[PDB]
Design a protein around this ligand. Structure first.
Ligand SMILES: Nc1nc2c(ncn2[C@@H]2O[C@H](COP(=O)(O)OP(=O)(O)NP(=O)(O)O)[C@@H](O)[C@H]2O)c(=O)[nH]1
Ligand SMILES: [Ca+2]
Ligand SMILES: [Mg+2]
Ligand SMILES: [Mg+2]
Length: 166
């Protein structure tokens, strides 16, 4: 059985925990409890392969990002998440890409750009704008909703498929 270590990063409140919990536990977390560092593990069949997913849910709030670098070190793939109704979270994606490059000491790390909360209508980040950012990094852009489940499996499974190409 193959093991894939995934790490979810991004600004505070963009929905990292809700996305992970929807994927793993199949329910939507409506409340906002800031994360320090949590991990989830689950066996799933992806494209015919039985594998073990180890997902690290990291802190987005600066005050709670103590040794985030250390926890991310073993990550093999990263979901860089921003919220489509939070322009600042989109503009700060570069901060996370930089951190990933540092922790992995590589400019070629499996990643997927995720625009979460696509169920909301106060959109300030248009799809095309995010597609362009992802293109510059040479990675896929996928929109998700931890609330409706739209694109959730697609985002995580795509990250696995990206790890498989590296
Ligand atoms: N409508 C909607 N709300 C969402 C979505 N994802 C998350 N939220 C809401 O946004 C708030 C923060 O989500 P949460 O998953 O805790 O964010 P986080 O990125 O994990 N925050 P932190 O970095 O501090 O740990 C919660 O109230 C949650 O319900 C989504 O896709 N749609
Ligand atoms: Ca609570
Ligand atoms: Mg969280
Ligand atoms: Mg605009």
């Amino acid at each position: 059985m193959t093991e894939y270590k995934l790490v979810v990063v991004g600004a505070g409140g963009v929905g990292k925990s809700a996305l992970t919990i929807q994927l793993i536990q199949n329910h939507f977390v409506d409340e906002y409890d800031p994360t320090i560092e949590d991990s989830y593990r689950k066996q799933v069949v992806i494209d015919g392969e039985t594998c073990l997913l180890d997902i690290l849910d990291t802190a987005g709030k600066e005050e709670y990002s103590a040794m985030r670098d250390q926890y991310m070190r073993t990550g093999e793939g990263f979901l860089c998440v921003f919220a489509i109704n939070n322009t600042k979270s989109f503009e700060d994606i570069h901060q996370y890409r930089e951190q990933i490059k540092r922790v992995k000491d590589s400019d070629d790390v499996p990643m997927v750009l995720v625009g979460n909360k696509c169920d909301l209508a106060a959109r300030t980040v248009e799809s095309r704008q995010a597609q362009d950012l992802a293109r510059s990094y040479g990675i896929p852009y996928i929109e998700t909703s931890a609330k409706t489940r739209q694109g959730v499996e697609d985002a995580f499974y795509t990250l696995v498929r990206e790890i498989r190409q590296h």
